[PDB]
């Protein structure tokens, strides 16, 4: 069975080359259905500090079947208990029509101290 | 009737699927004419600090007739009198051919302490 959101998505972008998906509540993760075979451009806007100040490096997860072509990791250092902008971005190939994908934040290096105003935005570029 | 400026913009991107607009001086706001019916991806590169250090959250405005589909707010905390990167980004639907739109920075939470090197860049994706 397909969800209401999944059902809407296929029809919504049926005649489109670009598609946008984001999760209005929390914004740390994005789950969506690819309306067509595409390349995903995932942007994770994030603010935070490392555990007791210090280093923290973040990235985006690679769902099964996808290839993380490129990844621009987000980094922050010091400023304990104060969240600072540390956006991460990654590009994925191999997304398939009708398939559901889930992208999350991943810890690349160091430990998390606390997040603020995270927002993951997915841009899909239709193949052909 | 269409103005010379309106016509120039419309002819410039006549055979384009993507268009870019930004404001040369200041960079806090962008005013432009949509060359065709589109979806806008507004990115506001911003640096700043909250009033006397502390919390400050920024976003982008929603001009009349448009729908802010998604918004990734920018945030900063502490570091009084030192501007730190706090970019915000928002996606809009409902832009119409020949219509003029104006996007500005908006204060989502907290108070402003002072800005540095702001740059708003508009990406337009033509509707098929």
């Amino acid at each position, epitope marked *: 069975d397909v969800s*209401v959101d999944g059902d*809407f998505t296929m*029809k919504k972008f049926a005649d489109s080359y670009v598609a946008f998906f984001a999760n*209005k509540g929390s914004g740390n993760t994005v789950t969506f259905t690819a309306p067509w075979d595409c390349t995903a451009e995932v942007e994770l806007f994030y603010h935070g500090w490392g555990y007791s100040g210090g280093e923290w490096e973040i990235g985006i997860t690679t769902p099964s079947g996808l290839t993380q072509i490129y990844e621009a990791t987000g980094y922050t250092n010091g400023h304990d208990n104060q969240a600072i902008s540390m956006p991460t971005k990654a590009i994925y190939s191999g997304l398939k029509k009708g398939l559901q994908y889930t992208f999350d934040i991943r810890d690349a290096n160091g430990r998390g101290g606390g997040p603020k105003h995270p927002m993951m935005i997915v841009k899909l570029y239709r193949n052909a | 009737d269409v103005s010379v400026d309106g016509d120039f913009t419309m002819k410039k991107f006549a055979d384009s699927y993507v268009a870019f607009f930004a404001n040369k001086g200041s960079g806090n706001t962008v005013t432009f004419t949509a060359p065709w019916d589109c979806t806008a991806e507004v990115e506001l590169f911003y640096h700043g600090w909250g009033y006397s250090g502390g919390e400050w959250e920024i976003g982008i405005t929603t001009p009349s007739g448009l*729908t*802010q589909i998604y918004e990734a707010t920018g945030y900063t905390n502490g570091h009084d009198n030192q501007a730190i990167s706090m970019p915000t980004k928002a996606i809009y639907s*409902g832009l119409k051919k020949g219509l003029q739109y104006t996007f500005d920075i908006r204060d989502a939470n907290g108070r402003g302490g002072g800005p540095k090197h702001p740059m708003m860049i508009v990406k337009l994706y033509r509707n098929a």
Partner: nanobody
Amino acid sequence: QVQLVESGGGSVQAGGSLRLSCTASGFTFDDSDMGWYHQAPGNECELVSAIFSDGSTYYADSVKGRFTISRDNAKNTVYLQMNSLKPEDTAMYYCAAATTTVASPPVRHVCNGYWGQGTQVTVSS
């Protein structure tokens, strides 16, 4: 929580017209995609029509040119103007929302009263 309310359905003869209304609450309406599902007894829960955040519309091939979906973002309401009704249009009509703030239910749940209880449309020959 997310609340959907449908009204408008009733008994009518073929060729007639009905206007279904759906008022929403519990989520940012302007950013959401709204739709109408229907289920005739013995058939599956199927999307009749949908109006997206960007103003664009979808219509099922069976209702194309007869039905019109519209929205009044100010009133948080979606309308399905059903014209040139056929006996095949007889179904229980359910309103649906696609907002990223709430979890999206499987389509089958919509026609089981996941949100609203639905509005019955009955068309005679």
